[PDB]
Amino acid sequence: MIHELLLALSGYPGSIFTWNKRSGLQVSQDFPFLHPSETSVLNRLCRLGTDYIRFTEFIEQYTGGLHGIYLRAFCTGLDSVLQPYRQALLDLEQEFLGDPHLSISHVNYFLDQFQLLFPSVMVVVEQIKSQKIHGCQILETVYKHSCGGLPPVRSALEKILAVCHGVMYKQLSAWM
Amino acid sequence: PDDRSWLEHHVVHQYWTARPSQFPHSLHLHSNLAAVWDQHLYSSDPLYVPDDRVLVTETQVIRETLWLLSGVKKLFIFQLIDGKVTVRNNIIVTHLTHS
Amino acid sequence: AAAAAANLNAVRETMDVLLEISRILNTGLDMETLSICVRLCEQGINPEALSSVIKELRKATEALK
């Protein structure tokens, strides 16, 4: 349950939280071994995992159409921004090792800063798909959102943008 | 007897070997998930014919995967049946329900 | 036994938490002295008397400086 979740929060859905592309991380199974209202909680939490599953698929395919070394620079920084979310999945299991009384609310509380970083990058990846932008103008729509309005997304898109500029420093060494 | 017990204890010989083993690990859902979900299924009337599976423990699966990574060929689980390593389906643990 | 030593492991865990609570509020106590303080509170006695005897004994060890 606290291993099934910690893999449903990872990229392996299982019998509880089934994965579909028309609706991700579905729950409809009645649980007389839990409380009735807990499902409501769980629904909210599902949105955190879904994006993380979504984010991986994008990194998989993009590593004419949508191609280039630019497409190997956005995905590369998107790994680094998810890195404190991978570490934060190990931390939960380490806490579960000792305590038997830990509940869902602590997991919700702990991963609070990731409900603001993840959705505002989801719009960026959908914009990069819907528009056929594949050259240097990928950096533009990052640069508009890097100004930011919420503190998580101000630093993580910065992480990605620096890598883009560093790959440009190879082309603009060979040229100059 | 006293040698066979020493075997059975210190080395495993219970999931590649026909002996139905148990390990009550202080049950109660957080690591009891497979049994809980199965009880729920029986109460909801599947209707019955329950699956008999091997009940392998956890560390053993980890060791098996790491062996597969080494390059050992023809294993007890992940045996090839078409030239593609095909995982065994008669597995059950005290959690995840094998899905 | 084995389960008895398991209980003796669990009570050492609780006692480590009792050390943690002592240091987050900044006391002069350490674990060796706390090991006495716990038995005193096990036997039952007014803890204001024990705080008073500790706050006299700490001012009787500043005469060694």
Binding site: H3 | S31 | A6, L8, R12, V38
Partner: peptide
């Protein structure tokens, strides 16, 4: 005797399946 004996350094290896007291 007892609390002095209690200060021993126990195991640091923990299980996953065992939740209630995994020594």
């Amino acid at each position: 005797l007892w609390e002095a004996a209690l200060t021993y350094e126990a195991s640091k290896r923990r299980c996953w399946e065992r939740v209630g007291c995994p020594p």
